[PDB]
Structure 1
């Protein structure tokens, strides 16, 4: 199949790579379980204005995002750096809920890289933002027939804001050459203006409540995790593990590496995970990739015989007519003390021939 022919000439051919598969999946998550206060953020009677948007830190809780889906008048549920359905399977830190009220047409401006008024002078998102934006209509609660003017936006500012920066300074703006000296007048306007929210207006102008969930991915110890249950730890076996949202396939072994108390992960010269410190039990598990190697099929011509031998390159014979060579483990050929000329080259001074297939 590899050579795309029904006749194979005499020689050694590299066909595939043997790799031992994992036997069971182990998930290790922090044992601590606290119901996360999402009710406070999502069910609040009053939200802040866009210029003074409310930021709440979420930490040291286990979050069930399934209920967010179960009850939801949220017309918009848009995630940028993570899948909505994978949130229950991951661990996070730096979780922030930013709540504010904006217009119907301004929901497009709560995005990375957007040019706008509330984007520049009220609420700025970074270009590398990860998380989910939730938007829902709040005409029933955040509007009045006479006009709900409680929500204000910064129309005028000297410079654009930074990401995750709030400006509540009620200082006058100078819109012209003439200085204003803190007094309103010609070409001197107040920066903060109120929205005219009325229920009689159509969609696009109705008040919308927006909550922005912001996360960080794996670059710190995590305190917010999904509802996934912690499994027991197994040693010296090939398993597919999930440590705090980090999935890998390897063997977990005891380690003699003196980790410092802050240190969690471990890395090799390739900056790839080589050890992990479990949150639930503070012990260091060295991570070693499961046994693998290249398979070479040593065969004579199909005209002569159909017998084959396999060489597992760089793999000792105890991790897979068995002969151990420096090249690897040879299965199907019998070592012969007698020395002959090289017929099929194996490597490290070892050659194979057909007489059964012998190795010498």
Structure 2
């Protein structure tokens, strides 16, 4: 049998990727209390760009390895974007207790996701200072995991009725967050986006980009065209498939032709040459010379 010289993997041109870049580079990020939610589906996700960029220094991933994130397939990916101070960045972790964590964004202990935080002092800080960002400071009970509260009702800290007026014992729950360039790194604003990965009964719609290799023809090579795995010799084929049709089979039901995903050309697959070996020999007593068929 002729063993396969090389292995070639062919997959369709990468397309339809969800706008991770847009959410990461969004000009304005929502306040932590009103954290935005992004739904990712029917897309191919490449995380190489996020890792490559210098600004995204923090890439802490819990429950899954970031390197194999592309390899692993997740039905739905959820992206939430909020800006928080450096001191409280630690609080956004599984099983971590903090003011931001308890009253703004809550992560369950069993959370499979990667949290991405990048310091963005220039964008979020002004010489005058930026008071647009707000954080919840007063809440009756700790927030449940992945729960968003936007209530502006005046907090009641006293027996006397609040009356809807923020008097003594009544304080507005949201507190303005102050950012300046001169402020220390801990006080300095950090943009944080956490990606949550989940698996559902419905077929996964989000998966990492599929790698491809150069086509090899007229040689015996292992082939993986669109998930069809076989060992064969690939040749140009006269036969023309219908547009929907991807691969072809003979009467025996063995695959005989495949259409390349990247280039729509039908290629015949022929099994690598194999045959029986027969030794033609005169009697051993007469001679030891042999001929092989």
- Give the TM-score normalised by the residue count of structure 2: 0.68
For residue 25 of structure 1, give the secondary structure of its aligned residue in structure 2. Answer: strand
1:73 to 38, 55, 73: 55
Cα distance change, pair 196–294 in 1 and its aligned pair in 2 (3 A): farther
**TM-superposed deviation, 1:148:** 0.8
For 1:128, the equivalent position in structure 2 comes to 110
**Structure 1 residue 72, shift from structure 2 partner:** 3.1
For residue 297 of structure 1, what is the aligned residue in structure 2? 279
In 1, distance between residues paired with 2:237 and 2:146?
41
RCO (CA 8 Å, sep 6+): is it higher in 1 or 2? 2
Structure 1 unaligned spans of 5+: 1-18, 312-360
- CA distance in structure 2 between the partners assigned to 1:169 and 1:63 by the alignment: 34
Is the alpha carbon distance of 1:106 and 1:96 closer, same or farther for their aligned partners in structure 2, counting shifts above 3 Å? same
TM-superposed CA distance for 1:157, in Å, is 0.9
Cα deviations by residue, 1:272-315 (Å, 9 ceiling, x for unpaired): 9999999999999999999999999999999999999999xxxx
Return closer, same or farther for 1:241/1:122 CA change in 2, 3 Å cut-off.
farther
For the structure 1 residues 244 and 299, does the alpha-carbon distance in structure 2 shift closer, same or farther, using more than 3 Å as the test? same
Stretch moving more, 268-277 or 168-177: 268-277
Does the 8 A contact of 2:14 with 2:210 survive in 1? no
Contact 1:23/1:238 (<8 A) preserved:
yes
C-alpha distance after superposition, 1:57-99 (max 9, x if no partner): 1111111211112223012111111112112212112201110
For the pair shown, the structure with the greater C-alpha radius of gyration is: 1
Q: Secondary structure at the match of 1:295?
A: coil
Gaps of 5+ in 2: none
Residues 192-227 of structure 1, C-alpha deviations (whole Å, 9 max, x = no match): 001111111111100110000110147652111111
Task: Indicate how the Cα distance of structure 1 residues 113 and 264 shifts in structure 2: closer, same or farther if over 3 A, else same.
Answer: farther
Tell me how far 1:33 sits from its aligned partner. 3.2
User: Within 1, Cα distance between the matches of 2:246 and 2:202?
Assistant: 9
Alpha-carbon spacing, 1:269–1:221, altered in 2? closer, same or farther (3 Å): farther
CA 1:138–1:234: 2 relative to 1, 3 Å: closer
CA distance in structure 1 between the aligned counterparts of 2:117 and 2:94, rounded to whole angstroms:
16
Looking at structure 2, the residues matched to 297 and 177 of structure 1 have their Cα atoms a distance apart, in angstroms, of 104
Q: Is the 8 A contact 1:89 1:245 kept in 2?
A: no
- Give the Cα–Cα distance (whole angstroms) in 1 for the partners of residues 106 and 286 of structure 2: 75
Q: Secondary structure at the match of 1:141?
A: helix
Q: Is this contact kept in 2: 1:91–1:245, CA < 8 A?
A: no
Q: Deviations over 1:1-22 (max 9, x none)?
A: xxxxxxxxxxxxxxxxxx9999
Change (3 A) 1:122 1:286: farther
- SS of the residue aligned with 1:68? helix
The offset of 1:114, in angstroms, is 1.4
TM-score by length of 1: 0.56
Match of 2:122, SS state, is: coil
Q: When you count strand as a share of all residues, which structure comes out higher?
A: 1
SS of equivalent to 1:133: strand
Find the aligned partners of 1:271 and 1:155 in 2 and give their Cα distance. 68
Measure how far apart 1:236 and its partner are. Answer: 24
Paired position in structure 2 for 1:254 = 236
Q: How far apart, in 2, do the equivalents of 1:185 and 1:295 lie? A: 99
Say whether the 8 Å CA contact 2:50–2:56 is kept in structure 1.
Answer: no
